[PDB]
C-alpha cells in the first residue's frame, strides 16, 4: 500500500503508447531504486527492464486527433514481491545446473550458471537495500568458480597429430576452457588430419555433443585461423544458432 509508482506515454497507436508508458514506468522505478541503495551504502548503477515486472495497472487511455496515451502504475510493495519472485525463480534455477552425473560441467552449462549469477546479483542488491530477506549467493559463486567458471575439461588427441597446431588448438579452446587431466569429467577428443575433427561425452556416458571443423588454406603457420575460427565456434555454441 505504502508507495504507487507511475509512468505514461504517448504515441501514435494504443499499443505504442502502452510499451512508452511502461517504459516510462521501469525508468522511473530505476531512479527510485538506484537512489535508495545510495541512500544507503556505507562511503543510476543498475537500470532494470520489464523482464522486472508482470501486469501492472492501466490508469488512464485517452486517445484523440490520432495520438493515444496510456499512463500506468504498481504498487512498490507488489513491485518489490516481484523482484523476490524473480530471485527466487533465479535460485532454484541454479540447483538444476550444478555438477548432476559429473563433477565437471560443460560450456552452455556454465555460460547459463554465468547468466543467472548475474542477473540474481542486482535484483539482490536491490531486495537487500528494501530489506527483504534471501541472504545469500556467496555458497553458489563457490560452486561457479571451482566447477563452472571456465572450467576443467580434459583434452585429448590422436597417437600422431601435430604440436604447434595443436598448440593452436589447446590455446584458443583455453579462452573458454580449463585443459585439465583431472577425470569423472567431460572428454573433447580430437584428431587433426590437417582440420580437427571434435568429440564430447562426460563421465559414465558417452554422449556424444560434439561437431568436427575444416579449412583447407594450407598456407603454413598461416593457417591460424582453425584457431580464430575455433573459438567463434565454440563461443556460438553457448546457444547462438549452434
Given at each position: ?103 565437471g560441467?560443460f ?45 576443467k575439461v580434459q ?22 576452457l580449463?585443459?585439465s587431466?583431472?577425470?569423472?569429467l567431460y572428454?573433447i ?54
Amino acid at each position: 500500500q505504502k508507495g504507487y509508482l507511475y509512468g505514461s506515454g504517448s504515441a501514435t497507436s494504443k499499443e505504442a503508447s502502452k510499451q512508452k508508458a511502461l517504459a516510462d514506468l521501469v525508468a522511473s522505478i530505476s531512479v527510485v531504486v538506484n537512489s535508495q541503495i545510495h541512500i544507503q551504502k556505507s562511503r543510476i548503477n543498475l537500470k532494470t527492464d520489464d523482464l522486472e515486472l508482470n501486469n501492472v495497472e492501466i490508469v488512464n487511455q485517452e486517445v484523440q486527433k490520432g495520438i493515444y496515451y496510456t499512463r500506468v502504475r504498481i504498487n512498490q510493495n507488489l513491485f518489490l514481491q516481484g523482484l523476490r519472485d524473480k530471485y527466487n525463480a533465479l535460485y532454484g534455477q541454479f540447483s538444476t545446473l550444478m555438477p548432476k552425473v559429473c563433477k565437471g560441467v560443460f560450456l552452455q552449462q556454465s555460460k547459463s550458471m554465468g547468466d543467472l549469477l548475474a542477473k540474481a546479483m542486482p535484483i539482490e542488491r536491490i531486495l537487500k537495500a528494501y530489506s527483504v530477506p534471501v541472504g545469500s549467493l556467496e555458497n553458489y559463486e563457490k560452486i561457479y568458480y571451482q566447477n563452472a567458471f571456465k572450467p576443467k575439461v580434459q583434452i585429448t588427441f590422436d597417437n600422431n597429430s601435430d604440436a604447434e597446431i595443436k598448440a593452436a588448438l589447446i590455446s584458443a579452446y583455453a579462452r573458454v576452457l580449463t585443459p585439465s587431466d583431472e577425470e569423472k569429467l567431460y572428454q573433447i577428443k580430437n584428431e587433426v588430419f590437417t582440420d580437427s575433427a571434435n568429440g564430447i561425452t562426460r563421465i559414465r556416458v558417452v554422449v556424444s555433443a560434439s561437431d568436427c571443423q575444416g579449412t583447407p588454406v594450407l598456407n603454413r603457420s598461416l593457417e591460424v585461423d582453425e584457431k580464430n575460427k575455433n573459438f567463434a565456434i565454440t563461443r556460438l555454441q553457448s546457444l547462438l544458432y549452434k
